[PDB]
Amino acid sequence: TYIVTTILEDPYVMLKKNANQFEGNDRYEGYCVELAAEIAKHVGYSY
Amino acid sequence: VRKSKGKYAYLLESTMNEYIEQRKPCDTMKVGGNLDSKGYGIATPKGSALRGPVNLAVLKLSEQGVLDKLKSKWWYDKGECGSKDSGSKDKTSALSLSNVA
Amino acid sequence: EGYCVDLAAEIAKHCGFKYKLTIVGDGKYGARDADTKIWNGMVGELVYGKADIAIAPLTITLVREEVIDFSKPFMSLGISIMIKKPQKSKPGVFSFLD
Amino acid sequence: FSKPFMSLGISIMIKKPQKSKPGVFSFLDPLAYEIWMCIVFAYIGVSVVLF
Ligand SMILES: O=c1[nH]c2cc(C(F)(F)F)c(N3CCOCC3)cc2n(CP(=O)(O)O)c1=O
Numbered sequence: 204t205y206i207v208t209t210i211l212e213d214p215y216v217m218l219k220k221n222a223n224q225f226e227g228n229d230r231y232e233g234y235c236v237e238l239a240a241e242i243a244k245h246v247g248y249s250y
Numbered sequence: 251v252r253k254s255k256g257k258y259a260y261l262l263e264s265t266m267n268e269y270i271e272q273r274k275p276c277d278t279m280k281v282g283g284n285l286d287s288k289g290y291g292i293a294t295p296k297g298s299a300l301r302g303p304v305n306l307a308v309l310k311l312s313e314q315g316v317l318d319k320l321k322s323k324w325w326y327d328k329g330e331c332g333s334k335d336s337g338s339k340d341k342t343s344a345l346s347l348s349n350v351a
Numbered sequence: 352e353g354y355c356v357d358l359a360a361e362i363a364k365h366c367g368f369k370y371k372l373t374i375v376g377d378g379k380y381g382a383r384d385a386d387t388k389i390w391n392g393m394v395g396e397l398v399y400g401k402a403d404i405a406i407a408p409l410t411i412t413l414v415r416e417e418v419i420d421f422s423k424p425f426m427s428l429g430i431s432i433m434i435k436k437p438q439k440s441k442p443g444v445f446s447f448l449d
Numbered sequence: 450f451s452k453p454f455m456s457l458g459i460s461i462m463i464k465k466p467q468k469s470k471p472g473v474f475s476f477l478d479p480l481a482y483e484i485w486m487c488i489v490f491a492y493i494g495v496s497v498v499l500f
Pocket residue numbers: 380381408409410411
């Protein structure tokens with residue numbers, strides 16, 4: 204796998220509500236989160 | 251700025267200004283164009299094999315109109331006050347009725 | 352002498368080298384051929400060994416970055432709108448109700 | 450670095466001017482309240498003198 208870093212205090216990556224129900228990267232939601240998913244889908248690598 | 255009521259003009263970046271205007275109670279607005287020109291970008295350790303295909307994926311997403319869709323969704327489709335009266339009401343030169351009510 | 356000329360003069364200052372302001376004989380940009388599958392313009396000149404650098408407003412994209420490593424854009428373009436200046440129209444009849 | 454996926458710039462943020470709904474008696478603005486009252490008191494004064 205790969206280790207990916209980002210900042211939290213920004214409208215790009217935010218902690219979605221009900222984070223206790225989710226776990227891992229699924230809890231983090233935001234514009235920058237969708238960009239990371241599309242790039243990982245195009246390149247083809249888990250992260 | 252919200253308390254000055256037309257007395258304090260804060261100078262910030264374009265993306266943060268558009269988000270604080272739309273995704274917040276819109277008592278302030280952005281006026282004028284950008285003074286300087288900057289640009290964001292994802293990084294990669296110096297001398298790594300994850301720079302070529304990553305750069306090609308960024309240009310592919312920006313060419314297929316995907317980044318413009320994601321921006322219009324998180325900045326406009328999810329604003330706090332929304333877009334009330336999206337059609338900008340032109341400044342009527344005629345005298346209103348409330349002025350002589 | 353223009354914008355790209357001054358840009359190349361400033362680039363050659365921070366990166367000392369010998370350069371000649373050559374002009375492309377085709378006057379076109381990077382366009383993939385239908386059947387020949389060969390480039391043209393500045394991309395065709397750089398892919399076949401005709402110039403050392405291209406100080407020109409080349410629109411970066413996916414079809415050109417795979418063959419020519421671009422740099423950070425010095426300026427951003429935009430598909431803008433142009434219209435005639437809003438001059439005073441001819442005042443028609445019933446203009447006293449304004 | 451990769452190619453810039455988003456462009457930005459130093460922008461200006463000012464308070465959005467409200468609609469500024471004029472008052473009900475906005476037509477009494479060109480003349481102060483002291484003028485309107487002095488006119489009424491001069492109106493009744495001239496009438497009594499004329500009588
Ligand atoms: O890399 C490119 N850079 C370009 C730069 C310019 C400009 F800088 F504005 F001169 C223009 N023009 C805009 C209108 O037509 C006349 C000249 C075209 C360009 N094109 C062709 P396009 O892709 O069809 O737009 C490119 O390919």
